[PDB]
């Protein structure tokens, strides 16, 4: 519901923790022609927990929405905003012509036409260093060998699809077996032990009999895996007890 | 409760529809087929069918 996002080169990361996010409350906003999740589905979010979730916001000129994805290449993917191949998140976009455009021509958004090399994933290069293609030092202003990289998009309501301003939101989360901070509007049932029962911890499901073993974890550990990478220990999100998972009879 | 459409609305707000043509292609008696004209039932010879 913000008024004006940032540029693609100066995208603003909004860290989010200590909450319960009901992702269903996002659909009631502007249309989502693209709600692609590359590591998970757009439905299993309200059933899983997350370690650290971030939200990147930036406007683009529409025809470049395809570059916001793993393995993508282009001006935005190479100089402004790049995502890794192991990405685990969801990408959302929608048109904002009536918000981030003006008939007189808006010049607040930039895309960093040029750069020395390809920017790395999740990095920012808002530095205003004038690129230099020649050998002689630049005179502080654009010249035959140095050019101003901070170009701009002259958005206008008259432009057509592929040129109108589209807002893009990139929600990333790490589903590693680490302490969780966001889980969703899920409910909590009483604890049962010493009997075969299904369990749904912070994203971890399975069958087994808990026994409350003596495993002494560390302040940053929440799960324990055996030789076969099968979880055998879990920490209670509502207490400090260390439970031991074992297969039923 | 009911929705409401209006011509002056923009893209997306316009009305859309959906249709799901469920099919069943297992080996069972056929009730619907394509316009493929039926040829003659040549018998007692190696032919494609």
């Amino acid at each position, epitope marked *: *519901n*913000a*008024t*004006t*996002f*940032a540029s693609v080169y100066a995208w*603003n990361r*909004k860290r989010i923790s200590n909450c319960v996010a009901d992702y269903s409350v996002i659909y009631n906003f502007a249309p989502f022609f693209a709600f692609k999740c590359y590591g998970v589905s757009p439905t299993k979010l309200n059933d899983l927990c997350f370690t650290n979730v971030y*939200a990147d*916001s930036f406007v683009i000129r529409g025809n470049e929405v395809s570059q916001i994805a793993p393995g993508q290449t282009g001006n935005i993917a190479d100089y402004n905003y790049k995502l890794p191949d192991d990405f685990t998140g969801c990408v959302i976009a929608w048109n904002s012509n*009536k*918000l*981030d455009s*003006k*008939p*007189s021509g808006n010049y607040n958004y930039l895309y960093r036409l040029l750069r020395k090399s390809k920017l790395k994933p999740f990095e920012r290069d808002i530095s205003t260093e004038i690129y230099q293609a020649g050998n002689k030092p630049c005179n502080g202003v654009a010249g035959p060998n140095c050019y101003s990289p901070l170009q701009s998009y002259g958005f206008r*309501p008259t432009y057509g699809v592929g040129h109108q301003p589209y807002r893009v939101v990139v929600l990333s989360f790490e589903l590693l077996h680490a302490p969780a901070t966001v889980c969703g509007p899920k409910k909590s049932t009483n604890l049962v032990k010493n009997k075969c029962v299904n369990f749904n911890f912070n994203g971890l499901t399975g069958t087994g009999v808990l026994t409350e073993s003596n495993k002494k974890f560390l302040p940053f550990q929440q799960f324990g895996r055996d030789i076969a990478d099968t979880t055998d220990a879990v920490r209670d999100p509502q207490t400090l007890e260390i439970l031991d998972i074992t297969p039923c009879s | 409760q009911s929705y409401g459409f*209006r011509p*002056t*609305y*923009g893209v997306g*707000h316009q009305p859309y529809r959906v249709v799901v043509l469920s099919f069943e292609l297992l080996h069972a008696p056929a009730t619907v087929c394509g316009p493929k004209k039926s040829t003659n039932l040549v018998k007692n010879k190696c032919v494609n069918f």
Partner: antibody
Amino acid sequence: QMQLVQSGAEVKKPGESLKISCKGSGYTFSYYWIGWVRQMPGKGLEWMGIIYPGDSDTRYSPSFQGQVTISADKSISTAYLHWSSLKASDTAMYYCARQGDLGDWILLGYWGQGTLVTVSS
Amino acid sequence: SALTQPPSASGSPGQSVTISCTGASSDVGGYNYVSWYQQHPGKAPKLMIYEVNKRPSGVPDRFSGSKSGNTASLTISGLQADDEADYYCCSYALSRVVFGGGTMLTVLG
């Protein structure tokens, strides 16, 4: 030269669905957000809602989501504030506004002249 | 949270006065969503400050704005006999315009 003009004063009884106007010229009315502001006697300003004359896109204040209906005629560049089942408490001055060539899309840089409304019984 | 302002303020010609404002909001777009409008007695308001470190074109330099934390400030380099009017700070961060409560400005009489 940009300029705005709204309807004149009005004094009527409740029940009637009043509808005042806010006409402007000198700009591309189809591509500039328009809205209205409420201000009771002795009180401050209160945001009513905005409209995008380019299409039917209209955002209304949460407390005024349905208490009033805002419309605009793109063929003549004239905004309208149509009411529905007026109440005696709706008496107040109403200013329409728009966004200029600078600032955010809802900065409300330019304002209208205002329209006094008294709908007592 | 709704915006709040001092009930009023006083001054005299030539003196530099300032007005405050508290209760702002924020978003991913920044924290500069504060605008001041001066409304004279019985007539349409006028925009005076937007992007507190800036202001519209043609606006006299007698006014200035600044922000600090959740509180803003409207600085005036000098008052005038015709400067007696109301002032309202307004926030437009989360696509929602929430005007201020209003504060009166007067001079010694």
